[PDB]
Every structure is written in structure tokens, then in C-alpha cells.
Design an enzyme around this catalytic site. Structure first.
Site, PDB file in Angstrom:
ATOM      1  N   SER A 165       0.367  -1.080   0.173  1.00  0.00           N
ATOM      2  CA  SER A 165       0.143   0.098   0.225  1.00  0.00           C
ATOM      3  C   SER A 165       0.602   1.286  -0.405  1.00  0.00           C
ATOM      4  O   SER A 165       0.529   1.830  -0.663  1.00  0.00           O
ATOM      5  CB  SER A 165      -1.179   0.300   1.243  1.00  0.00           C
ATOM      6  N   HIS A 175       5.525 -13.440   9.033  1.00  0.00           N
ATOM      7  CA  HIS A 175       5.550 -11.897   8.228  1.00  0.00           C
ATOM      8  C   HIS A 175       7.414 -12.067   7.430  1.00  0.00           C
ATOM      9  O   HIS A 175       7.747 -12.775   7.555  1.00  0.00           O
ATOM     10  CB  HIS A 175       6.432 -10.475   9.519  1.00  0.00           C
ATOM     11  N   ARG A 190       2.113  -3.994  17.769  1.00  0.00           N
ATOM     12  CA  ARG A 190       0.445  -3.970  16.914  1.00  0.00           C
ATOM     13  C   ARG A 190      -0.292  -4.891  17.816  1.00  0.00           C
ATOM     14  O   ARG A 190      -2.178  -4.385  18.143  1.00  0.00           O
ATOM     15  CB  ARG A 190       0.414  -3.853  15.788  1.00  0.00           C
ATOM     16  N   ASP A 195      -2.826  -8.821  12.645  1.00  0.00           N
ATOM     17  CA  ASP A 195      -3.938  -9.179  11.532  1.00  0.00           C
ATOM     18  C   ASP A 195      -4.510 -10.348  12.954  1.00  0.00           C
ATOM     19  O   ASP A 195      -5.845 -11.105  12.642  1.00  0.00           O
ATOM     20  CB  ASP A 195      -3.624  -9.457  10.412  1.00  0.00           C
ATOM     21  N   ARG A 229      -4.013   3.702   7.245  1.00  0.00           N
ATOM     22  CA  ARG A 229      -3.012   3.948   5.956  1.00  0.00           C
ATOM     23  C   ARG A 229      -2.615   4.887   5.624  1.00  0.00           C
ATOM     24  O   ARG A 229      -1.721   5.457   5.378  1.00  0.00           O
ATOM     25  CB  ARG A 229      -2.842   2.353   5.781  1.00  0.00           C
ATOM     26  N   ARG A 261      11.141   4.672 -11.124  1.00  0.00           N
ATOM     27  CA  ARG A 261      11.063   4.022 -12.560  1.00  0.00           C
ATOM     28  C   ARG A 261      13.073   3.095 -12.229  1.00  0.00           C
ATOM     29  O   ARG A 261      13.723   2.896 -12.980  1.00  0.00           O
ATOM     30  CB  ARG A 261      11.484   5.259 -13.667  1.00  0.00           C
TER      31      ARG A 261
HETATM   32  C1  LIG Z   1       3.864 -13.134   6.254  1.00  0.00           C
HETATM   33  C2  LIG Z   1       4.167 -14.692   5.526  1.00  0.00           C
HETATM   34  C3  LIG Z   1       3.181 -14.497   4.288  1.00  0.00           C
HETATM   35  C4  LIG Z   1       5.547 -14.674   5.587  1.00  0.00           C
HETATM   36  O1  LIG Z   1       5.523 -15.131   4.270  1.00  0.00           O
HETATM   37  P1  LIG Z   1       8.120 -15.163   3.585  1.00  0.00           P
HETATM   38  O2  LIG Z   1       8.067 -14.596   4.423  1.00  0.00           O
HETATM   39  O3  LIG Z   1       7.414 -16.007   2.560  1.00  0.00           O
HETATM   40  O4  LIG Z   1       8.295 -17.070   4.859  1.00  0.00           O
HETATM   41  P2  LIG Z   1       8.851 -17.173   5.508  1.00  0.00           P
HETATM   42  O5  LIG Z   1      10.166 -16.858   5.157  1.00  0.00           O
HETATM   43  O6  LIG Z   1       8.533 -17.814   7.083  1.00  0.00           O
HETATM   44  O7  LIG Z   1       9.458 -18.884   5.086  1.00  0.00           O
HETATM   45  C5  LIG Z   1       9.577 -19.808   5.446  1.00  0.00           C
HETATM   46  C6  LIG Z   1       8.194 -21.125   5.717  1.00  0.00           C
HETATM   47  O8  LIG Z   1       7.647 -21.195   7.082  1.00  0.00           O
HETATM   48  C7  LIG Z   1       5.983 -20.984   6.915  1.00  0.00           C
HETATM   49  N1  LIG Z   1       5.652 -20.243   7.558  1.00  0.00           N
HETATM   50  C8  LIG Z   1       5.313 -18.775   7.896  1.00  0.00           C
HETATM   51  N2  LIG Z   1       4.695 -18.743   8.952  1.00  0.00           N
HETATM   52  C9  LIG Z   1       3.470 -19.698   9.175  1.00  0.00           C
HETATM   53  C10 LIG Z   1       2.882 -19.729   9.971  1.00  0.00           C
HETATM   54  N3  LIG Z   1       2.147 -18.839  10.870  1.00  0.00           N
HETATM   55  N4  LIG Z   1       1.905 -20.933  10.172  1.00  0.00           N
HETATM   56  C11 LIG Z   1       2.431 -22.212   9.108  1.00  0.00           C
HETATM   57  N5  LIG Z   1       3.899 -21.873   8.296  1.00  0.00           N
HETATM   58  C12 LIG Z   1       4.036 -20.468   8.092  1.00  0.00           C
HETATM   59  C13 LIG Z   1       6.659 -20.642   5.428  1.00  0.00           C
HETATM   60  O9  LIG Z   1       5.097 -20.626   4.072  1.00  0.00           O
HETATM   61  C14 LIG Z   1       7.710 -20.874   4.351  1.00  0.00           C
HETATM   62  O10 LIG Z   1       6.694 -22.791   4.453  1.00  0.00           O
HETATM   63  P3  LIG Z   1       7.702 -23.027   3.129  1.00  0.00           P
HETATM   64  O11 LIG Z   1       9.598 -22.243   3.306  1.00  0.00           O
HETATM   65  O12 LIG Z   1       8.308 -24.434   3.823  1.00  0.00           O
HETATM   66  O13 LIG Z   1       7.467 -22.934   1.620  1.00  0.00           O
HETATM   67  C15 LIG Z   1       3.854 -15.849   6.220  1.00  0.00           C
HETATM   68  O14 LIG Z   1       4.531 -15.872   7.748  1.00  0.00           O
HETATM   69  C16 LIG Z   1       2.223 -16.265   6.673  1.00  0.00           C
HETATM   70  O15 LIG Z   1       1.913 -17.221   5.074  1.00  0.00           O
HETATM   71  N6  LIG Z   1       2.144 -15.743   7.291  1.00  0.00           N
HETATM   72  C17 LIG Z   1       0.796 -15.928   7.520  1.00  0.00           C
HETATM   73  C18 LIG Z   1      -0.574 -15.033   7.054  1.00  0.00           C
HETATM   74  C19 LIG Z   1      -0.433 -13.589   8.273  1.00  0.00           C
HETATM   75  O16 LIG Z   1      -0.856 -13.643   9.436  1.00  0.00           O
HETATM   76  N7  LIG Z   1      -0.575 -12.507   7.290  1.00  0.00           N
HETATM   77  C20 LIG Z   1      -0.206 -11.636   7.621  1.00  0.00           C
HETATM   78  C21 LIG Z   1       1.221 -10.612   7.133  1.00  0.00           C
HETATM   79  S1  LIG Z   1       1.056  -9.250   5.983  1.00  0.00           S
HETATM   80  O1  LIG Z   2       8.653   4.677 -21.048  1.00  0.00           O
HETATM   81  C1  LIG Z   2       9.009   5.137 -22.203  1.00  0.00           C
HETATM   82  O2  LIG Z   2       9.902   5.299 -22.085  1.00  0.00           O
HETATM   83  C2  LIG Z   2       7.661   5.409 -22.356  1.00  0.00           C
HETATM   84  C3  LIG Z   2       6.185   5.117 -21.535  1.00  0.00           C
HETATM   85  O3  LIG Z   2       5.771   6.103 -20.354  1.00  0.00           O
HETATM   86  C4  LIG Z   2       5.372   4.650 -22.292  1.00  0.00           C
HETATM   87  O4  LIG Z   2       5.458   3.831 -22.710  1.00  0.00           O
HETATM   88  O5  LIG Z   2       5.231   3.739 -20.821  1.00  0.00           O
END
Ligand SMILES: CC(C)(COP(=O)(O)OP(=O)(O)OC[C@H]1O[C@@H](n2cnc3c(N)ncnc32)[C@H](O)[C@@H]1OP(=O)(O)O)[C@@H](O)C(=O)NCCC(=O)NCCS
Ligand SMILES: O=C([O-])CC(=O)C(=O)O
Lengths: 434, 434
Positions: free
Chosen positions: B242, B318, B327, B373, B399, B419
Site C-alpha cells: 500500500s 511476517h 501492534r 492481524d 494507512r 523507474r
Molecule cells: C507473512 C508470511 C506470508 C511471510 O512468509 P515469507 O516471508 O514468504 O516466508 P518465511 O520466511 O516465513 O518462510 C518459512 C516457511 O515457514 C512458513 N510459515 C511462515 N509462517 C507460518 C505460519 N504462521 N504457519 C505455518 N507456516 C508458516 C512459510 O510459508 C514457509 O514455508 P515453506 O518454506 O515450506 O514454503 C507468512 O509468515 C504467513 O503465511 N503468515 C500467515 C498469514 C498472515 O498472518 N499474514 C499477515 C502478514 S502481511
Molecule cells: O517508458 C517510456 O519510456 C515511455 C512510456 O511512458 C511508456 O510507454 O510507458
């Protein structure tokens, strides 16, 4: 054979394997360094993302899955009776990496005609927008509102396998592309033709023709110009604001509607999507002040005066380029064929023979050649499309083709959430000392 | 004085000169390397952008201009008769880098009260949206449509000096923040209270209170919860989708309305802003299967069984945090004060006792601790706000404070267009081989 979805299903495992192989060979290989300056300078020069559909060839201009613009003009299917590449063909190329046959293009035209219907809540909303809401804002708001139609958003909610994401992305993207001319035409008509109806889709016409019909144009040459325009603005690598935005918002698994709308907010920015307009304004003001029958010498004189006041010559110079953008040349050839007598065109052709006059007489540019936007306005205006506030909507309809072709592949290839690390000035000053 | 705009005008030159010198002295210093994997992996671990308002230690959690959440809970002004920090003060902090006085917070509440009017076309569009258009889509479309009110867009078209961009961005941001509760509350009532009116803004209430009034909540604790919620979701560095989308779209000089609406389309993605809901759906399911007053033993059973089946415990982990989310702790403290006996909370707390243990006992975590969350849904549901699809709208309103604070600064500091360079797989392969 004709069903792009099945052809794409057969291509995806091969591309996955090829990527897996490269990452297993070179995942840890350093491809670039990050400096403090790159962080302050908008990631300029930083190789940040993978984007498969198009690449900038620095001696040939943009290539679409390896094909230059001149090559797309030769190879892509034309409308029967036509000289210009059909955008359907371009999209097929971006999706598959292959030049389509005539039959595949015809299948694609009919697919988009079938999917073109707007839900009434979007018709209503467009019909209620005031004339002081910019066309681009109307486009973005309507596309957002269309996400009530998203196959992907609903499947995701039900827990569909990751292996299937690309299919629903495909469906939504096809739906969106088919709807965009309808949306864009409704905006045009509501703003500039007193709210008259857009009329019907013809099942048997190509996308560009259905578009120019809904806009209320009849001219064969304008439909040909639209075919060309929608093809050449379709994609320009991943790093431009509109492509990057789509990429970034898509990486959070937002559906194509939300991704594309966010992209259009980026395209609406004065530094991304307003170059067409600035050129045309400048041409208008120029031609009124020196007259139609202006000689090279006096025109040359005018340009020098412009630059002696540190004013830019709009549409000459660029960010990353090195020669006349083939996207310009393409429009030049169009004009030389179809409107050689037009005054404003004759000025644009006159500015081409004279302006390069060295932006190295300065040193503070990078290129003395005109980009795409130096030619597009005069052609639109010639055909009666004079509402310059709408020009970026046409760019946006074009750009759908590229960014959605890429969005299908990003999900097919399982690209993760884009999430770079930020730092503050304080943080960075500390980091560099440690 | 109390005029934030004059205070900000005095800070900007200082920071400009401090950055200019830092870049002169250390612009070429390398702060990181780009690998092939980072390109394919969404820029993960790549230092990509400068973002001044907040910095996440992987360790101690988010800091707002150098202040932790605990520090802000103590230092930031409260409502008379309240205990939770007012979002107004958080915004003041993010903008100025200084903790506000009571008086400055009071002045800012009144400024937002006064700027809160919606134009008729936006009221109409919201009243016409159908019930199957998701709240986040309504929010984004509405914000896009508000860009008819953009001071920045109009000034830019008239050729304002770049030295002044931040002023109009400030004005538009203040107007947007003021309007957002009105938009958000209209959505809530149109969808979930049969179209009943939002009522009026009270000139002497804080932003959060006007908001809960317009939502139809009159419970003092729910206002306190909202005050805390909107403070703590306000900002989380620049790399989250975001904030990054807002930064990227903003960098093309799109106005705050377009930048923010693009950001919302990013927030609406399942991988960014739907975790709250995913948590709450999982907890509810859990509390059916294993019953109300479960024992630690039986709870650890379900958690093991979840991991065994390759299933994820939502709310834990995370992309950069590697410890308990401050949080989360915040929301815990509020729950321990106000609703300790709530069954769904007891479960959340129970899960904090269990889930981190087993998650390491496994060892496939990286971050075994809960994020924000994990805790928010059961607090919202407690107070009668059970419309899960709406939860991300609250996140979005929060946000705005962070991303708009930063957007003022980006324009003040003259940050250019974002860019990065993209590459195709083929192009990258060739680049590495050379
Ligand atoms: C936030 C999240 C997406 C980050 O994932 P990431 O940075 O890509 O992955 P990690 O470095 O933790 O990866 C290590 C492993 O642990 C897993 N893992 C991480 N958190 C986990 C959880 N709460 N439960 C189960 N497995 C989990 C990952 O999916 C990954 O599995 P893999 O290697 O077998 O594919 C992940 O922790 C998650 O799935 N969280 C649950 C959803 C959530 O609460 N999101 C809100 C935050 S934006
Ligand atoms: O990317 C460039 O140089 C020109 C442009 O803006 C586009 O096509 O997206």
C-alpha cells in the site's frame, strides 16, 4: 488450436522449468549494486523486476517477445482490407511468444466481442459522473467498480489451488480487455457527445473497429490509426509507472480489475501519461504564431529562441532511448501515406527535419530524436479526436494489452509479493557509518 | 504556531540541505547487492527506497519517527476522559518528527472537521453502488472520484513551481484525510444498515469520534479502540504494497486522491490486507471444532494437526518482522483491560501461549510470533462490527495517515519518478552470461 487458454496451458510448464533451471544455476549471482543515490533517485538504473512480455532494444527500440515494431507491422495479422497490425495479434504474441495465424486472431476478436457487456451498475456510475471529473479518473473508477465481476477474487475466497491462479487471471483479463472499449467509449460520449449511447458490439468486427464504432467514428483510416496506436502503445517493459504499478498491485493477488485501475492512476500522473497533450498544445500555439506556410529557416529560428529561454522542445528527448523511436516512424509512415497535405502533420514533418539540431549542443539531455508522443496528437486531431483530456484514455486501453499479458504470466510463474526494504535518511546515514 | 503548514515550511529547508550533503558525500556508497533471486522474488531484502515516516526494526517493531508504539501510547495526546492516542497526534508526529502538544492536536481535529464535506457526485456514486461491490472497491472508486477536488492537479496544469508542490499535496492530503471517515461511514451504512444517513460532523470532536458517530457506534470503548486502531495501522515503512503503491503512483505527480486510491487497490489484495478476516474465519472454525473452553492440551493438538496437514496458522509470521508485533501487544493490552472474559479473546491469548512454542518445535517458521492481524478481528467483532468484508476499510483509513504524511515529504524533497529497470528471463540470462 485456436483456444489461447489451452495453448497457454501447454506453454506454462516449459517456462516454469526454464526459470527454475536458471535460478538453480544463478540465483545467488550478483547482477547489480544498490547505491544511496539509487534509493534517493527512484531506483534509477537498478534491475528490480522480471517482466517477460517486452524489452527495450537500445539499437532497435521496444521488442515485443523479441519482435521489433517493424517486424510486428510485417508479421501480425491485419484486418481484411487493412494495412495496420491488429491489437488482438499483439496480445496473442505477448501471451504466447508466437505470431498468431489469421484464424487465431479471428478467434480472439470474437472472444472479446462475446465478453464485452457492461454490468448496469457501471453504466449507471459512468452516466452519473460530472464533466469536471477527468476522463482518466472515470476510467479508473469504472474499472475498479467492474471488479464485482472478478472470477479470480471469488475463486481465491473459496481456496483455489495456487496452480490455478493464472486461469482465473486469464479469464478476468480477457473480460477486462473486452470491456475497456465499452467503458472508454461511454466516457467519451458522456463527456463530448451529450450522453448519447455507444450502441452495440458487432460479433464479427475486430476490437479496434468495435471501439471506433462506439466512439461514433466511421472513417476507415481512423480505425486503421486506432489499430496501429493500440498495438504500439501496448507494452514498454515493466519499469514504467503503469506497468510497475500493475505488477506491484497484482503481486498482492489483487485481481486484474484492481491491478489495472491502480495502473491507470499511475498513467494519469503528469510525468507518465501527459506527453501527447503537451506536444499538441505546443504545436497548436506554434503553428498559429508562425503560420502554416512557415519556411525551414524561420522555423529553425523559432526553435533556437525556444531553447535560448531554457524551454524544452516537447517530444524530443527521452528517458532511455538512442535513435528515432520506431513508434514515431510508424506514425510518420502512416501520415505520409494518408494525410500528406494536412498542415499540422506537415509542421510535425518539418520539425523532424530541423529539430534534432543537437540537444548535445547542450549536453544536458541524452537524445536529439522524437519519441512516440511527438506524433500521436496531430493524427488524433486530424481524424476529429480533438478532446486532448481523453488522449491518455487511449494510451490506457492500449497498455491493458501489455500489463495483463504480463499479469497472467506473473501468476502462472508464481511471482511473489513485491516488498523491497525502505530506509529513512536517518537510518541510511547510520547504515553508511556502520 | 499551531498551523502545521507553517511548521512544516520551516522544517523542509533543513532536511533538503541535510539530504543534499549526504548525497554529495555518500551518493556512490553501496548499501546492498541485487541477485537474480531478488529479481524473481519480489525485491525481497532489496534496499529500494527512502521513506522517512517510519522504520521497522525486524526486532523491536515499527518506529514512528524514532518512537515505538509503547512510547507513542504514553506521549501522544488523548481525548479528554480517554486513554488511547489520538490519530491526529500520530499524523502530526509523522509530518513534523515532533510529538504534538494538546493544543496542536486540538487545532488539527478542528481542521479535519472543517474539510470533511463530500461533493454531491461522490455521495451519489456511493448511494448507487450495489451490495455485491466489495467495500474496498467502493472506497477506492470513491477516492478516485474525489480527485475532481484536487488542488494539486489544477495547480500542476497551470505550471506551478516545483518548489511549491508540497503545499498543494499537503492541502489535498488534509482534505482527503478529513473526508475519508465520511466515505468509509457511507459505505458501512449503505451496505450494512440499509442506506441510513451518516448524520453530521461535530466541529469539536476528534476525527475518530466523528467517525464512530457516523458509523452508528455510540460506545465510548469502541471509539477508544478506533483511536488506537487508526493510530497503530497508520504506517509500516515504505516497502509494504500500500505504501509502496502510493509512493510509486505519487512519484509520477499523481495527486493524493489517485495515489491513495491506487494504494487501496493494493491493500485490497489478499496477501496484504485480508489477513484480519482470514484469522477470524480460522478462529471461528477452530472454536466450533474444539468447543468453547478448550484446554491447552487439546488446543496444542489442533495446532500440531494443522501443521502436520501442511496447513498454516494465520496471524503468525511476517516478511520482515522477526518477533512479537508491537501492534499485536497493543491490542492484547486493550483486550486484557476491556474484554478479558470474551471467549474469542481467551482463545487468541491461549493461542499466543501455544502457537509460538510448537512453531519453533517444528522449525519451519522464521517468525513464530503473531502479527497485528492475529488480534484485530476479535476486538472488532466484540463491539458489534461483524462485517468482515469491511475490516480492511478501517485499515485503509488508518494507512492514509502514514502514506500521505510521506507523500508530502516525497514532494518536498523532490523525489523523482520511481523507474527501476525490468528484464526478461531471456535478457537476464544473456546479461548474466556476458
Ligand atoms: C507473512 C508470511 C506470508 C511471510 O512468509 P515469507 O516471508 O514468504 O516466508 P518465511 O520466511 O516465513 O518462510 C518459512 C516457511 O515457514 C512458513 N510459515 C511462515 N509462517 C507460518 C505460519 N504462521 N504457519 C505455518 N507456516 C508458516 C512459510 O510459508 C514457509 O514455508 P515453506 O518454506 O515450506 O514454503 C507468512 O509468515 C504467513 O503465511 N503468515 C500467515 C498469514 C498472515 O498472518 N499474514 C499477515 C502478514 S502481511
Ligand atoms: O517508458 C517510456 O519510456 C515511455 C512510456 O511512458 C511508456 O510507454 O510507458
Amino acid at each position: 488450436s485456436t483456444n489461447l487458454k489451452d495453448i497457454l496451458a501447454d506453454l506454462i510448464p516449459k517456462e516454469q522449468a526454464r526459470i527454475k533451471t536458471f535460478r538453480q544455476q544463478h540465483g545467488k549471482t550478483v547482477v547489480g549494486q544498490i547505491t544511496v543515490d539509487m534509493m534517493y533517485g527512484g531506483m534509477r538504473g537498478m534491475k528490480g523486476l522480471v517482466y517477460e512480455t517486452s524489452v527495450l532494444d537500445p539499437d532497435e527500440g521496444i521488442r515485443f517477445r523479441g519482435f521489433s515494431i517493424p517486424e510486428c507491422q510485417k508479421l501480425l495479422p491485419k484486418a481484411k482490407g487493412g494495412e495496420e497490425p491488429l491489437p488482438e495479434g499483439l496480445f496473442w504474441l505477448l501471451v504466447t511468444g508466437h505470431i498468431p495465424t489469421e484464424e487465431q486472431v479471428s478467434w480472439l476478436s470474437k472472444e472479446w466481442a462475446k465478453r464485452a457487456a457492461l454490468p448496469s451498475h457501471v453504466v449507471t456510475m459512468l452516466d452519473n459522473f460530472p464533466t469536471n471529473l477527468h476522463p482518466m479518473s472515470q476510467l479508473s473508477a469504472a474499472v475498479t467498480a467492474l471488479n464485482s465481476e472478478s472470477n479470480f477474487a471469488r475463486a481465491y475466497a473459496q481456496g483455489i489451488s495456487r496452480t490455478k491462479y493464472w486461469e482465473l487471471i486469464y479469464e478476468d483479463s480477457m473480460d477486462l480487455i473486452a470491456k475497456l472499449p465499452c467503458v472508454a467509449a461511454k466516457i467519451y460520449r458522456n463527456l463530448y457527445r451529450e450522453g448519447s449511447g455507444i450502441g452495440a458490439i458487432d460479433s464479427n468486427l475486430d476490437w479496434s473497429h468495435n471501439f471506433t464504432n462506439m466512439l461514433g467514428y466511421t472513417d476507415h483510416q481512423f480505425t486503421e490509426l486506432t489499430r496501429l496506436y493500440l498495438t504500439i502503445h501496448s507494452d514498454h517493459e515493466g519499469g514504467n509507472v503503469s506497468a510497475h504499478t500493475s505488477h506491484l498491485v497484482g503481486s498482492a493477488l489483487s485481481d486484474p480489475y484492481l491491478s489495472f485501475a491502480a495502473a491507470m492512476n499511475g498513467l494519469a500522473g503528469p510525468l507518465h501519461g501527459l506527453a501527447n497533450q503537451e506536444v499538441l498544445v505546443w504545436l497548436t500555439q506554434l503553428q498559429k504564431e508562425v503560420g502554416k506556410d512557415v519556411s525551414d529557416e524561420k522555423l529553425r529560428d523559432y526553435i533556437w529562441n525556444t531553447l535560448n529561454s531554457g524551454r524544452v522542445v516537447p517530444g524530443y528527448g527521452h528517458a532511455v532511448l538512442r535513435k528515432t523511436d520506431p513508434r514515431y516512424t510508424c506514425q510518420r509512415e502512416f501520415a505520409l501515406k494518408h494525410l500528406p497535405n494536412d498542415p499540422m502533420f506537415k509542421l510535425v514533418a518539418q520539425l523532424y527535419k530541423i529539430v534534432p539540431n543537437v540537444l548535445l549542443e547542450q549536453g544536458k539531455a541524452k537524445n536529439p530524436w522524437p519519441n512516440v508522443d511527438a506524433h500521436s496528437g496531430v493524427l488524433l486531431q486530424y481524424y476529429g479526436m480533438t478532446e486532448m483530456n481523453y488522449y491518455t484514455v487511449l494510451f490506457g486501453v492500449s497498455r491493458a494489452l501489455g500489463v495483463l499479458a504480463q499479469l497472467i504470466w506473473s501468476r502462472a510463474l508464481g511471482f511473489p509479493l513485491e516488498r523491497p526494504k525502505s530506509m529513512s535518511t536517518e537510518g541510511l546515514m547510520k547504515f553508511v557509518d556502520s
